[PDB]
Structures are given as structure tokens and as C-alpha cells.
């Protein structure tokens, strides 16, 4: 069992925080917010670094390039923006979605960005040019999450339509549609680190690990509350192998991936924990909460 303990509370976003992510080089945490801003913080000391501004409406997601130099952000202003972190410059504004952009991610080579939108589409963008390369007719309801696999050859998407879909990056073809009894809205999805599984959150207070190729649910994680928000989930791999998620009861939940038992609940946020992130090399977790709290917390364990 881990022993995550609070180390720092990071404050100053003026509205709900939407997403927190650690830079791949482990040096930084980036946060996005309904306040239309991105903030950068020291990953190990929680020290505020800088604010990055330019979106015209709130931002629901942010993601780092593999070399930790760029960010992409997804906004209700219907665009994504690519940012040079050290200069703060907006390098490109990605236009094409017809509604809120909700989620985003770079591929491992970082030459592509994938986005999902309330317009029900998934779009694949060229980083260098800013051009949309493909528009996938992915879902029949808002797209809640998009993620590339370890070698970038696949994209997984999730939707309120109750489905998770696997896409061939090169062709745009849908290679798989995952179906689960009752088709509860899917609020989050991501590949496992080895790319063999996908972790999916549904708005019925449940997280599941799936062997998507075979359409077999291998694990189910419950105990938390998730019925209204798209809460991030994660695979913790620097120490023990955990599943980490936020929750609508203001707690961070940690489960043993194999046993499915809850091994820790982290307390002291005062609103829904919308986002959690796991450091790439240290046993550190970042968490972020909604409007009534607006703080980010950094927790650290010995294992």
C-alpha cells in the first residue's frame, strides 16, 4: 500500500481547474482552468512558474509534447492552441471543430495532435503546420477523451454515446468498437502503458480495464463517485502498480490494479477532484478540484 501524503497546495487559478499534467521530463506540472488560463508549476516544489494566456473561453484539457517543450490546450472557444512553453508564445491555433474542444493529446513522436470535441468528431492535426489532417466521424455524442498508444499507431476515443473506439492513426479507420452492457456514458479512456489495454471510466461510478482487442473486461474498480464529470484516471507505475482517479466526493482514490482493492483515499480537497496525474519517475501525484476549491495538490509516497 502506498503512503501518499500532502506536500504542497498550489493556488491562484480564479476558477475551477480542469486538467493537470506532468511534463515528460518530470520537471513541471501544467494546469488548465475555466479561467481561460494555463499555469506552470514546479513538479517537485510546487512553485508557481508562469501563466500562459490567449484562449477566449475556458480550457478543458492540456497536454505536453514528448520533449516537454510544447503544450496543446483544448478550449470552449472551439480551438486548440499549441504553445512554446519557455517563451509563452502561441505557435498555432487549430481551427475546425464546430463546438467545444474537450480533450487533447500529442502522439509520442509529437508530430501529431488528436482532439475530441462536443461536435462528436475526433480530429488529427499536423503540429508543424497546424493543419487538420483528418476528421473522424467518431461518435454520436460528445467525445470525452482521446489518447494515442505507445507507438502512435492507434487512437482510442470515448463518448457519452456509450462507446469506446479504436482508430488506425494512418488510415482513419475504426478498428474496434467496445460495447458494455447498458452503454453507460463513457467519461474517460486511455491506453495502458503497454498499449494492450484501455482503462475506461463510465458515469455509473465505475472504472474498467479492458483487453479491447478481445472485448474482455479484465478488471473493475469501484468505491468512488463518478456520475456527472469527465474525471481523469491513471496508471501509476513508478512504485506499486496502482489505478489513480479523482472522485465527486472530493477524494483521490488509489486502487491496486490487480486486486482491485482500494489502497488509499487522499483527503483535503473541498470540491470534486476532476483531474489526477502521476509523475513519470517519482511517486508523486497531482490532483485538482473544481470551482469551490480551485486548488491543485501534490502528494508524495515512499512507494
Amino acid at each position: 500500500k502506498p503512503n501518499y501524503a500532502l506536500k504542497f497546495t498550489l493556488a491562484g487559478h480564479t476558477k475551477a481547474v480542469s486538467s493537470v499534467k506532468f511534463s515528460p521530463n518530470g520537471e513541471w506540472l501544467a494546469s488548465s482552468s475555466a479561467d481561460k488560463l494555463i499555469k506552470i508549476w514546479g513538479a517537485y516544489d510546487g512553485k508557481f512558474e508562469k501563466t500562459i494566456s490567449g484562449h477566449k473561453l475556458g480550457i478543458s484539457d492540456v497536454a505536453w509534447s514528448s520533449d516537454s517543450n510544447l503544450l496543446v490546450s483544448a478550449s470552449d472557444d472551439k480551438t486548440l492552441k499549441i504553445w512554446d512553453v519557455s517563451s509563452g508564445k502561441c505557435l498555432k491555433t487549430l481551427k475546425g471543430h464546430s463546438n467545444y474542444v474537450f480533450c487533447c493529446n500529442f502522439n509520442p513522436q509529437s508530430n501529431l495532435i488528436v482532439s475530441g470535441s462536443f461536435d462528436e468528431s475526433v480530429r488529427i492535426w499536423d503540429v508543424k503546420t497546424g493543419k487538420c489532417l483528418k476528421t473522424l466521424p467518431a461518435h454520436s455524442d460528445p467525445v470525452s477523451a482521446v489518447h494515442f498508444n505507445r507507438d502512435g499507431s492507434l487512437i482510442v476515443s470515448s463518448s457519452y454515446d456509450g462507446l469506446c473506439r479504436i482508430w488506425d492513426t494512418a488510415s482513419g479507420q475504426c478498428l474496434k468498437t467496445l460495447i458494455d452492457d447498458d452503454n453507460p456514458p463513457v467519461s474517460f479512456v486511455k491506453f495502458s502503458p503497454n498499449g494492450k489495454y484501455i482503462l475506461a471510466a463510465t458515469l455509473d461510478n465505475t472504472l474498467k480495464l479492458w483487453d479491447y482487442s478481445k472485448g474482455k473486461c479484465l478488471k473493475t474498480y469501484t468505491g468512488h463517485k463518478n456520475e456527472k464529470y469527465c474525471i481523469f484516471a491513471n496508471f501509476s507505475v513508478t512504485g506499486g502498480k496502482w489505478i489513480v482517479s479523482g472522485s465527486e466526493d472530493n477524494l483521490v482514490y488509489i486502487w491496486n490494479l490487480q486486486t482491485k482493492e482500494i489502497v488509499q483515499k487522499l483527503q483535503g480537497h473541498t470540491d470534486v477532484v476532476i483531474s489526477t496525474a502521476c509523475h513519470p519517475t517519482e511517486n508523486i501525484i497531482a490532483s485538482a478540484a473544481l470551482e469551490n476549491d480551485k486548488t491543485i495538490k501534490l502528494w508524495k509516497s515512499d512507494c
Binding site: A16, S18, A34, G58, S60, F102, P185, L203, K228
Partner: peptide, 10 residues
């Protein structure tokens, strides 16, 4: 916004 809730189905 992700920060705003989806009314659960009735």
C-alpha cells in the same frame, strides 16, 4: 467546460 456537470440521465 469539463468543469461543468452533465446532468445525469433521469
Amino acid at each position: 467546460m469539463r468543469t461543468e456537470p452533465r446532468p445525469p440521465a433521469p
